[PDB]
Design an enzyme around this catalytic site. Structure first.
Site, PDB file in Angstrom:
ATOM      1  N   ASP A  25      -6.222  39.098  16.639  1.00 36.06           N
ATOM      2  CA  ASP A  25      -5.576  40.330  17.095  1.00 36.06           C
ATOM      3  C   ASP A  25      -4.091  40.054  17.414  1.00 36.06           C
ATOM      4  O   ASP A  25      -3.764  39.555  18.509  1.00 36.06           O
ATOM      5  CB  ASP A  25      -6.269  40.903  18.308  1.00 36.06           C
ATOM      6  CG  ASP A  25      -5.713  42.217  18.768  1.00 36.06           C
ATOM      7  OD1 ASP A  25      -4.621  42.623  18.324  1.00 36.06           O
ATOM      8  OD2 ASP A  25      -6.464  42.886  19.501  1.00 36.06           O
ATOM      9  N   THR A  26      -3.206  40.421  16.501  1.00 37.63           N
ATOM     10  CA  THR A  26      -1.775  40.209  16.671  1.00 37.63           C
ATOM     11  C   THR A  26      -1.225  41.101  17.800  1.00 37.63           C
ATOM     12  O   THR A  26      -0.121  40.843  18.266  1.00 37.63           O
ATOM     13  CB  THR A  26      -0.958  40.501  15.406  1.00 37.63           C
ATOM     14  OG1 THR A  26      -1.285  41.855  14.960  1.00 37.63           O
ATOM     15  CG2 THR A  26      -1.346  39.548  14.280  1.00 37.63           C
ATOM     16  N   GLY A  27      -1.936  42.170  18.174  1.00 36.61           N
ATOM     17  CA  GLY A  27      -1.448  43.064  19.234  1.00 36.61           C
ATOM     18  C   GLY A  27      -1.823  42.552  20.621  1.00 36.61           C
ATOM     19  O   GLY A  27      -1.283  43.144  21.568  1.00 36.61           O
TER      20      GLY A  27
HETATM   21  C1  LIG Z   1      -6.573  50.750  19.399  1.00 39.03           C
HETATM   22  C2  LIG Z   1      -7.635  49.795  20.013  1.00 39.03           C
HETATM   23  C3  LIG Z   1      -7.110  48.372  19.927  1.00 39.03           C
HETATM   24  C4  LIG Z   1      -8.025  47.268  20.506  1.00 39.03           C
HETATM   25  C5  LIG Z   1      -9.431  47.359  19.928  1.00 39.03           C
HETATM   26  C6  LIG Z   1     -10.446  46.346  20.421  1.00 39.03           C
HETATM   27  C7  LIG Z   1     -11.690  46.469  19.789  1.00 39.03           C
HETATM   28  C8  LIG Z   1     -11.895  45.970  18.493  1.00 39.03           C
HETATM   29  C9  LIG Z   1     -13.134  46.134  17.886  1.00 39.03           C
HETATM   30  C10 LIG Z   1     -14.159  46.793  18.565  1.00 39.03           C
HETATM   31  C11 LIG Z   1     -13.960  47.282  19.861  1.00 39.03           C
HETATM   32  C12 LIG Z   1     -12.733  47.106  20.453  1.00 39.03           C
HETATM   33  C13 LIG Z   1      -7.294  45.969  20.205  1.00 39.03           C
HETATM   34  C14 LIG Z   1      -6.218  45.691  21.073  1.00 39.03           C
HETATM   35  O1  LIG Z   1      -5.241  44.855  20.595  1.00 39.03           O
HETATM   36  C15 LIG Z   1      -6.139  46.126  22.393  1.00 39.03           C
HETATM   37  C16 LIG Z   1      -5.180  45.715  23.382  1.00 39.03           C
HETATM   38  C17 LIG Z   1      -3.737  45.751  22.922  1.00 39.03           C
HETATM   39  C18 LIG Z   1      -3.248  47.084  22.371  1.00 39.03           C
HETATM   40  C19 LIG Z   1      -5.428  44.530  24.069  1.00 39.03           C
HETATM   41  C20 LIG Z   1      -6.265  43.549  23.557  1.00 39.03           C
HETATM   42  C21 LIG Z   1      -6.519  42.343  24.245  1.00 39.03           C
HETATM   43  C22 LIG Z   1      -5.957  42.067  25.481  1.00 39.03           C
HETATM   44  C23 LIG Z   1      -5.099  43.029  26.037  1.00 39.03           C
HETATM   45  N1  LIG Z   1      -4.558  42.793  27.293  1.00 39.03           N
HETATM   46  S1  LIG Z   1      -3.185  41.953  27.379  1.00 39.03           S
HETATM   47  O2  LIG Z   1      -2.886  41.767  28.844  1.00 39.03           O
HETATM   48  O3  LIG Z   1      -3.341  40.655  26.587  1.00 39.03           O
HETATM   49  C24 LIG Z   1      -1.920  42.975  26.632  1.00 39.03           C
HETATM   50  C25 LIG Z   1      -1.431  44.028  27.376  1.00 39.03           C
HETATM   51  C26 LIG Z   1      -0.615  44.966  26.735  1.00 39.03           C
HETATM   52  C27 LIG Z   1      -0.274  44.854  25.394  1.00 39.03           C
HETATM   53  C28 LIG Z   1       0.516  45.810  24.793  1.00 39.03           C
HETATM   54  F1  LIG Z   1       1.303  45.345  23.812  1.00 39.03           F
HETATM   55  F2  LIG Z   1      -0.271  46.695  24.125  1.00 39.03           F
HETATM   56  F3  LIG Z   1       1.270  46.608  25.511  1.00 39.03           F
HETATM   57  C29 LIG Z   1      -0.757  43.729  24.700  1.00 39.03           C
HETATM   58  N2  LIG Z   1      -1.569  42.798  25.344  1.00 39.03           N
HETATM   59  C30 LIG Z   1      -4.866  44.191  25.330  1.00 39.03           C
HETATM   60  C31 LIG Z   1      -7.197  46.984  22.773  1.00 39.03           C
HETATM   61  O4  LIG Z   1      -7.366  47.423  23.941  1.00 39.03           O
HETATM   62  O5  LIG Z   1      -8.146  47.407  21.919  1.00 39.03           O
END
Ligand SMILES: CCC[C@@]1(CCc2ccccc2)CC(O)=C([C@H](CC)c2cccc(NS(=O)(=O)c3ccc(C(F)(F)F)cn3)c2)C(=O)O1
Ligand SMILES: [Cl-]
Ligand SMILES: [Cl-]
Ligand SMILES: [Cl-]
Ligand code: NA
Lengths: 99, 99
Positions: A25-27
């Site tokens: 997950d690049t996000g």
């Molecule tokens: C549109 C839904 C996207 C996703 C889906 C997950 C998933 C996949 C398959 C089946 C079910 C669910 C993947 C994802 O990257 C995130 C977020 C980032 C948008 C995410 C993922 C992992 C950790 C975090 N928390 S964090 O503290 O590492 C963080 C906080 C904020 C952001 C920011 F860039 F989005 F702002 C990025 N990372 C967030 C999420 O909440 O769900």
């Protein structure tokens, strides 16, 4: 490998002696794994994503093998719906997005 | 381009003549962007992320430029921490994950 994105980019990982499936997950800033035991110390953390925040346990200096590539870093453990390899470990295996 | 992951992979998008910042997210099936006006009809959808599920508005066949590449496809509008470009449009711009 070169992974196309027609489907979810799922790979096998090895963590805490266990083989698991995880999503590249690049996000995601961080790596977050479904509930499991890990050795050593941990501290509580809240992390946010779509849907809001979850409470996790933060374990530092954990070794993981991702599709055959070894990396070390922080791993968060908590009620994520899927195991997620985030940027903190994708950088260590030299992953890039290309277009 | 080849984008490394030491920082968030944020790019400029253009939708509705407006420039916005968005996150390239290989862990997202779909593209979800913050509240904005889009043309046409919408359909209901519920999507999951790490914090649980949210309701979004699904707009189909929306023109969106991503890092200078044209896409035309489905955009979800709803509560989201950041604008997210997911696999439905990453595939349209030819993106792959490499390591
Ligand atoms: C549109 C839904 C996207 C996703 C889906 C997950 C998933 C996949 C398959 C089946 C079910 C669910 C993947 C994802 O990257 C995130 C977020 C980032 C948008 C995410 C993922 C992992 C950790 C975090 N928390 S964090 O503290 O590492 C963080 C906080 C904020 C952001 C920011 F860039 F989005 F702002 C990025 N990372 C967030 C999420 O909440 O769900
Ligand atoms: Cl366990
Ligand atoms: Cl780390
Ligand atoms: Cl689409
Ligand atoms: Na530790």
């Amino acid at each position: 490998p070169q992974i196309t994105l027609w489907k979810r980019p799922l790979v096998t990982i090895k963590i805490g002696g266990q083989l698991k499936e995880a999503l590249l997950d690049t996000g995601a800033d961080d790596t977050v794994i479904e509930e499991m035991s890990l050795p050593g110390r941990w501290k509580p953390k809240m992390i946010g994503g779509i849907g809001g925040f979850i409470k996790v346990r933060q374990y530092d200096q954990i070794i993981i093998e991702i599709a055959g590539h070894k990396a070390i870093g922080t791993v968060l453990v908590g009620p994520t719906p899927v195991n997620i390899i985030g940027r903190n470990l994708l950088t260590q295996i030299g992953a890039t997005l290309n277009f």
